[PDB]
Symmetry: C4
Subunit: 25 residues, 4 copies
C-alpha cells in the first residue's frame, strides 16, 4: 500500500501519458 | 504509507504539471 | 512495499525514459 | 516505506528534473 497522495500522483501520471499518446496518434 | 522520498517526488511531479498547464494557458 | 498501481506506474515511467533516450541516441 | 523499485524511480525522476533545469539555465 502507498500514501493516498502517491496513488493519486501515479494515476495522474498514467492518464497524462495516455492523453499524450492519443494526441499524437 | 510511502517512503518520505516518494511522497516528496509525487508532490514535485504534480506541481510541475500544474505550473506547465498554467504556463500554456 | 507499494500499491500495485504505483509499482506499475513507476515501471512505465522508467521504460518511457529509456525509450526516449534510445530514440535520441 | 515503499517498494525499492518505486524509490529508485522517484530518485531518477527528481534527478531528471534537476538536470533539465540546469540545462535550460
Ligand atoms: Ca500521509
Ligand atoms: Ca527510507
Ligand atoms: Ca507502504
Ligand atoms: Ca490498493
Ligand atoms: Ca517487491
Ligand atoms: Cl509507495
Amino acid at each position: 500500500s502507498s500514501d493516498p497522495l502517491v496513488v493519486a500522483a501515479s494515476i495522474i501520471g498514467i492518464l497524462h501519458l495516455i492523453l499524450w499518446i492519443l494526441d499524437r496518434l
